[PDB]
């Protein structure tokens, strides 16, 4: 059984840290694909949950986190993000 | 074969439809007897 209310498992990533991380990744990607190139991040597409979600073992449980809140943005030349 | 119903059908959260209360006839220590078992399974682990 489950004691108490039924709640969904989730992961929190802060917005400021993730946004800085992506800014650095884009800065480095522009060194291979050139500058004045737009770098767009997007969610994964098809396939099994093993590849469409972020799979990991958390304390013995197997989590499959959506991540589509982490990878959506277009880069042109405390406020957490909760992932179901 | 499992006989399942919705564990908490009145939720409005993202878990509506997830966590089913499934009953089944499980084996036991002796080969002559059966045990009725109720357990909760996630939707992703159970196929209709």
């Amino acid at each position, epitope marked *: 059984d489950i004691i108490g*209310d039924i709640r969904m498992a989730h992961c929190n990533v802060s917005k400021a840290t993730w946004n800085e991380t992506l800014g650095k990744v884009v800065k480095q990607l522009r060194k291979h694909f050139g500058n004045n190139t737009i770098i767009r991040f997007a969610q994964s597409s098809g396939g099994d949950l093993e590849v469409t979600t972020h799979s990991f073992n958390c304390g013995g449980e197997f989590f499959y986190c959506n991540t589509s809140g982490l990878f959506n943005s277009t880069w042109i030349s405390n406020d957490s993000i*909760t992932l179901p | 074969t499992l006989q399942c119903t919705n564990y908490t059908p009145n939720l*409005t*959260s*993202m878990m509506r439809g997830e966590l089913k209360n499934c009953s089944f006839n499980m084996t036991t220590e002796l080969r002559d007897k059966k045990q009725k078992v109720y357990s909760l399974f996630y939707r992703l682990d159970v196929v209709q």
Partner: antibody, heavy 128, light 105 residues
Framework: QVQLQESGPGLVQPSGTLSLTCAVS?????????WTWVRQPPGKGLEWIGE???????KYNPSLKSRVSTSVDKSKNQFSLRLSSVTAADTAVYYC???????????????????????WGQGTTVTV | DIQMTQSPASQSVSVGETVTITCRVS??????LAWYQQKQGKSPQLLVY???NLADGVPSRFSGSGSGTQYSLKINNLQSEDFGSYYCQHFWDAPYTFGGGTKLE
């Protein structure tokens, strides 16, 4: 003791946009409530327009497809609707209300339930 | 979308009688329903939240009941101040549609 009051001047011309602002006084807009708008045409039943939370999360009635947007302003304790492309069927009394919820988990995951639209405002008549 | 039906369309009753207003829903909404009273031009006020919990400040003569796909509001010892329109709203799924409404006179 929330005392809501709508403004939102009417006499909007066809193909224009409405701007209806509901003031909140007696509380903040950071409480465990959704700020909601409804519509009641002159002689028809009561329609739901939409809801906005304190974080900017919104819900809209699909019938107002790409016609309605909602916003909040925490520095004013105000929230408002911007309903575009009015024709003639939008003449109605518009109301704002505080839709109370009980929160047990994370709001962005839908871990809450509604306790009814308490503390309705007085309403603003909007004609087109 | 869920369809909310309210019936009888109207009632004509005397003071002191008990009346029932019934809301029928196309889907089981697990008592996520609310009962509002619109006092003849005034903003609607909340009578019942949760289908069977009396709203704070509402007279005890208003009592909700129901389950599944059928919900009703019973008004005992109906007074003159209770005449007006009554509305039911499903909180189960969005858009939180409002039942057509009934007129109690």
């Amino acid at each position: 003791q929330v005392q809501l009051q709508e403004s939102g001047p009417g006499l909007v011309q066809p193909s224009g946009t409405l701007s209806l602002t509901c003031a909140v006084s007696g509380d903040s807009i950071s409480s465990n409530n959704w700020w909601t708008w409804v519509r009641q045409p002159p002689g028809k039943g009561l329609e739901w327009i939409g809801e906005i939370y304190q974080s900017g999360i919104t819900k809209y009635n699909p019938s107002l497809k790409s016609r309605v947007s909602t916003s909040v302003d925490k520095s004013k304790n105000q929230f408002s609707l911007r309903l575009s492309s009015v024709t003639a069927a939008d003449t109605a009394v518009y109301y704002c209300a505080r839709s109370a919820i009980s929160i047990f988990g994370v709001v962005v995951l839908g871990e809450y339930y509604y306790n009814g639209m308490d503390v309705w405002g007085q309403g603003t008549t909007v004609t087109v | 979308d869920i369809q909310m039906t309210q019936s009888p369309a109207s009632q004509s009753v005397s003071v002191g009688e008990t009346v029932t207003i019934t809301c029928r829903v196309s889907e089981n909404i697990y008592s996520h329903l609310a009962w509002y009273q619109q006092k003849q031009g005034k903003s609607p006020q909340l009578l019942v939240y949760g289908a069977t919990n009396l709203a704070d400040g509402v007279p005890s003569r208003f009592s909700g009941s129901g389950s599944g796909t059928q919900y009703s509001l019973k008004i005992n010892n109906l007074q003159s101040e209770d005449f007006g329109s009554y509305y039911c709203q499903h909180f189960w799924d969005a858009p939180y549609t409002f039942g057509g409404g009934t007129k109690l006179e």
